[PDB]
Nucleic acid binder design. Sequence first.
RNA 1: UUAACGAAUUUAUGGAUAAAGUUUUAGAGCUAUG
DNA 2: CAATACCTTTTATCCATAAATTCGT
DNA 3: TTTAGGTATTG
RNA 4: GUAGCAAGUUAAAAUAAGGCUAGUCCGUUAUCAACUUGAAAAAGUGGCACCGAGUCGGUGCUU
Length: 1326
Amino acid sequence: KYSIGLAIGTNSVGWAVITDEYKVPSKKFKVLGNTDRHSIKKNLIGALLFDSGETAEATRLKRTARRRYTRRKNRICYLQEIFSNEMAKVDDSFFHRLEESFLVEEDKKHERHPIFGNIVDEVAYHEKYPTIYHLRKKLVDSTDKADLRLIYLALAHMIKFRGHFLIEGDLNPDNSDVDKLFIQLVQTYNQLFEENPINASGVDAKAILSARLSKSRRLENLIAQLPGEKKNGLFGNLIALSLGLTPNFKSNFDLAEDAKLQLSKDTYDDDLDNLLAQIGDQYADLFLAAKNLSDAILLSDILRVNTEITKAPLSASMIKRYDEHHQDLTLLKALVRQQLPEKYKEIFFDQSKNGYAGYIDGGASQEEFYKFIKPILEKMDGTEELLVKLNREDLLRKQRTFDNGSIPHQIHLGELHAILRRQEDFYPFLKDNREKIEKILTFRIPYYVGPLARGNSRFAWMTRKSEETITPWNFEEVVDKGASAQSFIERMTNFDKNLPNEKVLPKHSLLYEYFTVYNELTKVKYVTEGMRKPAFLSGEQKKAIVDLLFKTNRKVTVKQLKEDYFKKIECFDSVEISGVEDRFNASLGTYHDLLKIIKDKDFLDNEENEDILEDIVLTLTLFEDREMIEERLKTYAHLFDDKVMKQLKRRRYTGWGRLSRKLINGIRDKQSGKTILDFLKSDGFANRNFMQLIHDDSLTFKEDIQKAQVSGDSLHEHIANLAGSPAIKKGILQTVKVVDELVKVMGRHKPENIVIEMARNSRERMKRIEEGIKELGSQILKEHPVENTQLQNEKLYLYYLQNGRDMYVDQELDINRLSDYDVDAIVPQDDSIDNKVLTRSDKNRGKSDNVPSEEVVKKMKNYWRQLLNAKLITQRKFDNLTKAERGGLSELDKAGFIKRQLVETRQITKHVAQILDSRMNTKYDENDKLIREVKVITLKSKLVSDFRKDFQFYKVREINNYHHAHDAYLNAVVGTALIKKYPKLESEFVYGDKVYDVRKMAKYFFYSNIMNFFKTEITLKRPLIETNGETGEIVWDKGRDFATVRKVLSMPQVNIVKKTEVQTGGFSKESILPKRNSDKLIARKKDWDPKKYGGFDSPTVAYSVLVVAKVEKGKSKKLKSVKELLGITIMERSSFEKNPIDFLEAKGYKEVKKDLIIKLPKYSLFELENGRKRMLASAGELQKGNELALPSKYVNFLYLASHYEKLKGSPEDNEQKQLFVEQHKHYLDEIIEQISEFSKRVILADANLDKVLSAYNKHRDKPIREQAENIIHLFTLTNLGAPAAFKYFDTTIDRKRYTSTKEVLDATLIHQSITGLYETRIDLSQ
RNA sequence: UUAACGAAUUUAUGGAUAAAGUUUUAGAGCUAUG
DNA sequence: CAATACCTTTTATCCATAAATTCGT
DNA sequence: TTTAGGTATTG
RNA sequence: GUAGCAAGUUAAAAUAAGGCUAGUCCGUUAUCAACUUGAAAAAGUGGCACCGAGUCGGUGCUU
């Protein structure tokens, strides 16, 4: 006897309940707790507010670094382990001294100076190597033996910061002068070619080769410079090669098959010799010269500076940076003293300022310092040399900045290698471990491996050959690299939907292809002259045809079948095929790709070979890595000629299928003994399809299927599997929790109807007219100009696409009065530009029930075509405009019109329907078919949206939160209504498979716009009492039912519930905070008194706990009993739950009443005093609790007062809409007054209200549309939720926050249910 | 996901890396003047 | 106290898998 | 991308 | 301590406290009114009708 209407979003589930006659019911509810309120009445309408669900993404990102850091201290640790034994000879406590570098000297356990214990030698060190980058250049350049500590600092510093792995390959210090490298390339081609020598001449190889242009555009510029040679010529292919293009030398040598070579792709080292053996090995020397150039190009942008003197360009790059800063510092530092020496203290001494002193000592960014002194630079002479340095964005640069991520790790290795190479003569262990160290900088755990777990990671999948611990150096021997990469993909691969216990087969699987082929073929039927009736393909023909036609050719067309098989093999001269369209959809692409490679047709047909052929595709489809496939296939090498093997590694397959191996060939009917496949060929004269095979009660397949699936899943797994936003899933979980408690409410009775709905260019307008009057060539853009911000008004913008002439009358339109002109939809109500037109009168188009008439088209069938070529209209706009000459909107064209509009297309929402639909109908009748006890409906969001506008139930968001339920109410009404009149739409609108026929055009309705029947009076007659045509059920009364809808909207009591949530996540605000003598400073790691070292701050409060114990006071230390709110932080909560009391005593409580302790989750609910409500937003803060039920007349007024998007509706209706403003103009004083009684009652912020009251007084004479909108802001003051700031038109009003929580402790605590209806209240007394 | 195959973008889940930030210490502040 | 003002790590790169979405053949 | 809770200090 | 001036660009170390399963692992997502039951997963618990409407008020029958 009831129906539920849901309105789902990101932050709300809205829910209302409807009657046979569309009221919203009520009921008295029993109330628990020690309070005198023992029962209360509530309406059966509401919404459920919650904070949005959070993606795992941010979390997983924290995970990455968590991993990066525990692996970086690991890498530096490895270098120490190499050094430890040998460093100890030089310095006993060097490593210790660095470990404890961060400790204050009071806490230091060794000398304060790290590199060397003595004060004196540290001073010199920084004297001679101010930056590490200084030291690095020295360690690379000098031939002298350098101190081991110094050596260690260089290596570890490159190892701590490697730069990126975004190159695969290698790069050298020799490869910096591209010309020097270029000429060597030219030189080799010349020591090899005496008929066509080339000359280097005066080609600016350096400038041409390395520039921001395409890898292609640079290429053309090289060969342009030279004496004229073909980009296709050999030298161009080599120049091309370096540039990273794929160049094919086939045309040059006219080789039999094409062999291109790319230097980024893997196949380069292998391809070169495959080409090289035919060409001869002499030629090989050239290509390496060409690769070398590539490497010179590659780093040519990363270190643009000259690096000719040294083997350490990066550090050379830094050292030049450091000196320019020193140079430019003094030039600035002096020039400020020279002419403007008053500000110097502000710039260079005050840290807070964003001066240089701020730049270095303060936290100002390079960006902030540059901006701050650009004024000063251009107020003093000699600035310009300095300023061209600032506009360059290269001034007083730090060595280490955001920029450096650009550097490729390789360039660091070259400095480390060169450092190691230098000093290995002096220290033996370095020569031995040089290789072992280099792997540290070079090593990177490959992604397909995943984290190297020992079964203790959710995420990890890798596999190991030996259970021993993994170093960068033994990785290959312990880690099963390949079988890891299979596991890697296999976990993200789909399962088989029909039996989701077995993995999907590769889509290109040979078993898969056959199944996909035979299922299309079983349903093929042939009709011939001899036969009385059409007959299925029989068991032999499928088996013949496939051997005959599918093995011969990749794709099989129908004419191929009748001429190649039917006429040739059965000698039927004519036949007719019902079963398939113009060609067979399936194909055996692998058979042929496999047939052509192994070149053995016998090998493909022996069924004993199928187990071996599946594995080749599965390994072939799986693996990315050239090497890796081979380690797998080697088991098979014997079956095959070595040349056969070579082609197989090449073919790689992309994509995973739909179905399991087991389903197709493993499952077997206990009765028939035959598998799925074996029923797909040879089913006898009645030949069944795959769906039919699973859906045959007599066969074991439907029963065998059902067993795997139940073994189903709980709600979260059912809900979480859903595809879409992780947040809108939350509303779903809550939306279903909401229905289920609604069910509890109706005496455990189920509802008949359920209606669910979920909610979801400024310059684009300027460019589509710019180019559409450019190809029209018209001067209507020149005649009157407009701006880019203006065209969000339709009637202005539609004039411009039209060019000033009406598509219905062919005359020029006045610019000033578009008010008199109508916007016309090409098709009777679509609001897009595609279907909107502007003419003086919309009756010119013909009948208003008719498509734009033949009468107007004939004058302007040409104007609309002029507009299409100028992209001033679209194919959808035009094909609807001319549509009168295609018989107009056909009954079947009009069926496309409304049917497309109404049905929900979104795959998430659909799934929700199942979720509800399956959760309702548990009962099954004696037949297998389901009982549709409850009907689920999915409504588009627009349908209600226009109805509110059409039928005076206007929506304003920010006044209130009641509108959330109000859409749920309105969604239940429009829903139950559209299905009450038309069951023919039950199959379209409801998850229920019945079936609906398009043919009608059960006569129902002539007109194309669906939402008409509610209307008492409609724009060109309906009886006010509506009934279904076929059964006589009375469905809509235009007079009777409407009163209650406006009344229910108008209802002042709705259930608004904001879901209560223990706070999860990060412990505290992330920033490190400087040492302080505060007690709220959280220590970073144990031995660091934040007072000494700095610490954290601002912990997040997981939940509040109410305490009722005693405490010590004064030097007296007297015990007196306190009751208050304790803030359990996220860090604390783990510790708190183990022992509440011991933990409580440690925070200072004595004699806690253990039993009365209440954990108050966030958004917790209290009503105190006069029934104003407070939500606990923290242990120490509170949040607004009451929504102000603005009377319906004001909402409706304010929406029209707000004058949303000028006026969209019909213009005669608009004069009453404007009239309503003046008639209800005195309301503005009434609206403001509503707030005042409510603020004074609930908000208790009078401080603020006063600047408000003293502000509406001031702008009384300002217009209403402007005044009303600014009035709307205020409600955020009155709004449930957080104090946040709002502004009246000229004044910003700050928020009134509740920094004391005492008022709760003596109030009545409210626990409410998910609906809000069932409660337990608790009045608080110590 | 389509009446069927492909391509793309998006979002979701997952992996491997990078560069900045922040914090305490080390980078002997000197010269007049109590 | 309760106002008051102030605070709140970010920005890249590569690889995979999947739905869902809108194009194509 | 802006929220809305910490946090310390004032008249 | 106030005046004067020199100075500055780098480094090391930590990067959620930390946990045991000590792995070159894990540590911010989802999930949560209350009461009884449960290790948890979860299951259980709240008469109806009418008249009305400033955030639910009254009344009749059963209870």
